[PDB]
Design an enzyme around this catalytic site. Structure first.
Site, PDB file in Angstrom:
ATOM      1  N   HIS A 199      16.141 -10.648 -16.391  1.00 33.41           N
ATOM      2  CA  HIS A 199      15.788 -10.546 -17.796  1.00 33.41           C
ATOM      3  C   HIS A 199      15.081  -9.223 -18.105  1.00 33.41           C
ATOM      4  O   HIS A 199      14.496  -8.592 -17.212  1.00 33.41           O
ATOM      5  CB  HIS A 199      14.961 -11.748 -18.267  1.00 33.41           C
ATOM      6  CG  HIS A 199      13.819 -12.080 -17.360  1.00 33.41           C
ATOM      7  ND1 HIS A 199      13.965 -12.853 -16.222  1.00 33.41           N
ATOM      8  CD2 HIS A 199      12.515 -11.739 -17.419  1.00 33.41           C
ATOM      9  CE1 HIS A 199      12.799 -12.966 -15.618  1.00 33.41           C
ATOM     10  NE2 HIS A 199      11.904 -12.295 -16.321  1.00 33.41           N
TER      11      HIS A 199
ATOM     12  N   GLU B 120      11.887 -12.743 -11.167  1.00 37.24           N
ATOM     13  CA  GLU B 120      10.497 -12.996 -10.813  1.00 37.24           C
ATOM     14  C   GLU B 120      10.236 -12.682  -9.348  1.00 37.24           C
ATOM     15  O   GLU B 120      11.171 -12.644  -8.543  1.00 37.24           O
ATOM     16  CB  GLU B 120      10.116 -14.452 -11.100  1.00 37.24           C
ATOM     17  CG  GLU B 120      10.246 -14.839 -12.546  1.00 37.24           C
ATOM     18  CD  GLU B 120       9.578 -13.849 -13.487  1.00 37.24           C
ATOM     19  OE1 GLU B 120      10.285 -13.287 -14.335  1.00 37.24           O
ATOM     20  OE2 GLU B 120       8.369 -13.605 -13.364  1.00 37.24           O
TER      21      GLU B 120
ATOM     22  N   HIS C 299      14.442  -7.401 -14.365  1.00 33.69           N
ATOM     23  CA  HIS C 299      13.884  -7.938 -13.129  1.00 33.69           C
ATOM     24  C   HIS C 299      14.140  -9.440 -13.008  1.00 33.69           C
ATOM     25  O   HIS C 299      14.387 -10.122 -14.002  1.00 33.69           O
ATOM     26  CB  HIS C 299      12.360  -7.665 -13.083  1.00 33.69           C
ATOM     27  CG  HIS C 299      11.594  -8.450 -14.097  1.00 33.69           C
ATOM     28  ND1 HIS C 299      11.616  -8.148 -15.447  1.00 33.69           N
ATOM     29  CD2 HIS C 299      10.828  -9.561 -13.972  1.00 33.69           C
ATOM     30  CE1 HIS C 299      10.886  -9.029 -16.106  1.00 33.69           C
ATOM     31  NE2 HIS C 299      10.407  -9.905 -15.237  1.00 33.69           N
TER      32      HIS C 299
ATOM     33  N   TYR D  51      -0.336 -10.629 -22.343  1.00 35.34           N
ATOM     34  CA  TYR D  51       0.308  -9.370 -22.690  1.00 35.34           C
ATOM     35  C   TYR D  51       0.133  -9.091 -24.158  1.00 35.34           C
ATOM     36  O   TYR D  51       0.611  -9.864 -24.991  1.00 35.34           O
ATOM     37  CB  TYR D  51       1.809  -9.396 -22.394  1.00 35.34           C
ATOM     38  CG  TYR D  51       2.162  -9.650 -20.959  1.00 35.34           C
ATOM     39  CD1 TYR D  51       2.244 -10.952 -20.453  1.00 35.34           C
ATOM     40  CD2 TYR D  51       2.453  -8.589 -20.107  1.00 35.34           C
ATOM     41  CE1 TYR D  51       2.578 -11.175 -19.117  1.00 35.34           C
ATOM     42  CE2 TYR D  51       2.799  -8.804 -18.778  1.00 35.34           C
ATOM     43  CZ  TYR D  51       2.850 -10.090 -18.296  1.00 35.34           C
ATOM     44  OH  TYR D  51       3.183 -10.267 -16.980  1.00 35.34           O
TER      45      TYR D  51
ATOM     46  N   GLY E  93      -1.078 -13.445 -11.899  1.00 36.68           N
ATOM     47  CA  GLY E  93       0.109 -13.467 -12.738  1.00 36.68           C
ATOM     48  C   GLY E  93       1.206 -14.343 -12.173  1.00 36.68           C
ATOM     49  O   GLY E  93       2.166 -14.670 -12.865  1.00 36.68           O
TER      50      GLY E  93
ATOM     51  N   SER F 143       1.877 -15.618 -19.687  1.00 39.48           N
ATOM     52  CA  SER F 143       2.839 -16.079 -18.699  1.00 39.48           C
ATOM     53  C   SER F 143       2.285 -16.281 -17.301  1.00 39.48           C
ATOM     54  O   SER F 143       1.206 -15.792 -16.949  1.00 39.48           O
ATOM     55  CB  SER F 143       4.031 -15.138 -18.615  1.00 39.48           C
ATOM     56  OG  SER F 143       3.581 -13.870 -18.215  1.00 39.48           O
TER      57      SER F 143
HETATM   58 NI    NI Z   1       9.746 -11.972 -16.045  1.00 39.08          NI
END
Ligand code: NI
Ligand code: ZN
Lengths: 347, 4
Positions: free
Chosen positions: A276, A190, A188, A177, A170, A288
């Site tokens: 975000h 990244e 969170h 997703y 990931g 992603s």
């Molecule tokens: Ni994110």
């Protein structure tokens, strides 16, 4: 008075870009471009790819693909503050997921405009725990797609596997997703305060909230105040991705934030240290991964990492500092590197 | 390393 970069996107608002096919082809050039416009100041940007561009011919063969660890999202709390608990359910197919997502029990409620749907989300998020087909290892991209291919973006994050052989699922590989109504992603940044790219392959919109990197610390201070038990146990508890905070709660405490809704066929980019959160409108599929640019390097060096779990994402910064900051390697290694990050600066 |  102010600097050039400080003058671009001074309200740190989420920007939307419509690249021509020519501009779209060079991914890392385009990232550098949108930063030259101050997009990164928002924490989040939208990139709508040219109409005659597609990552896949059709999504008609994907019904039989497996989601090995779907999670039921049990949300606890009230008054704009919530903790999300993930209950792992048994493996299911996309078809088994879609049937449940579109079933009367779990489907999107009727509504006139986004604000109504958004109000219903914050009103009902603790009821009827939904299932999210989250963190599925894979791509929906076709092999030959050379433009913005989430499976092979060719940024400097590649130096991790190049140097070490280490794959982090990931992070330097893609995730899929599968969403349904009221599935959420908690507040969170990244891992290692990297960038992310998110492409919504098909389905109902995904709505996003962002807090500018310039104001990240303000959000953490609030979070720490609302969850003082969690702040004592972990240096970076938001990385557990369990914490939901409504936009009205953020307004109340004067944390700047913005909102965007992502449609099918649209890219979202998150920028280093951009907090975000968000939710899905209904059945959809997103892809992603993380990525890096030279500007990430200092964020990676200063990223505050979760101190209480052993499986957390931890990248050795050594190779990046060595390669791209040779003046500062010896200083950094001896813990004497005092570089302050300017969140408005590009490159 | 790790996992996301
Ligand atoms: Ni994110
Ligand atoms: Zn932790």
């Amino acid at each position: 008075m102010a600097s050039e970069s400080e003058t671009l996107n001074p309200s740190a608002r989420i920007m939307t870009f419509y690249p021509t096919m020519e501009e779209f082809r060079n991914f890392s050039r385009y990232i550098a471009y949108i930063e030259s416009q101050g997009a990164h100041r928002a924490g989040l940007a939208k990139v709508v790819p040219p109409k005659e561009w597609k990552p896949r011919a059709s999504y008609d063969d994907i019904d039989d693909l497996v989601i090995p660890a779907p999670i039921q999202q049990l949300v606890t709390g009230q008054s704009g503050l919530f903790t999300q608990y993930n209950i792992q359910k048994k493996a299911m197919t996309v078809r088994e997921f879609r049937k449940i997502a579109n079933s009367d029990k779990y489907c999107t409620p009727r509504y006139s405009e986004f604000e109504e749907l958004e109000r219903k989300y914050w009103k009902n998020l603790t009821f009827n725990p939904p299932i999210y087909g989250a963190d599925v290892n894979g791509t929906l991209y076709e092999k030959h797609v050379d433009e913005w291919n989430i499976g092979r973006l060719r940024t400097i994050l590649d130096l991790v596997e190049k140097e070490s052989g280490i794959t982090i699922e990931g992070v330097n590989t893609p995730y899929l997703y599968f969403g349904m109504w009221k599935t959420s992603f908690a507040w969170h940044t990244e891992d290692m305060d990297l960038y992310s790219i998110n492409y919504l392959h098909f389905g109902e919109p995904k709505s996003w909230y962002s807090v500018p990197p310039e104001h990240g610390k303000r959000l953490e201070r609030l979070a720490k105040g609302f969850f003082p038990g969690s702040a004592q146990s972990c240096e970076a508890f938001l990385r557990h991705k369990m914490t939901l905070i409504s936009p009205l709660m953020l307004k109340k405490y004067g944390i700047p934030f913005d909102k965007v809704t992502q449609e099918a066929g649209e890219f979202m980019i998150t920028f280093p240290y951009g907090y975000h959160a968000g939710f899905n409108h209904g059945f959809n599929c997103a892809e992603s991964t993380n990525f890096a640019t030279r500007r990430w390097i200092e964020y990676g060096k200063q990223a505050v990492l979760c101190s209480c779990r052993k499986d957390m994402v931890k990248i050795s910064m050594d190779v990046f500092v060595r390669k791209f900051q040779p003046e500062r390697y010896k200083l950094w290694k001896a813990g004497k590197d005092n570089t302050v990050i300017d969140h408005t600066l590009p490159t | 390393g790790g996992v996301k």
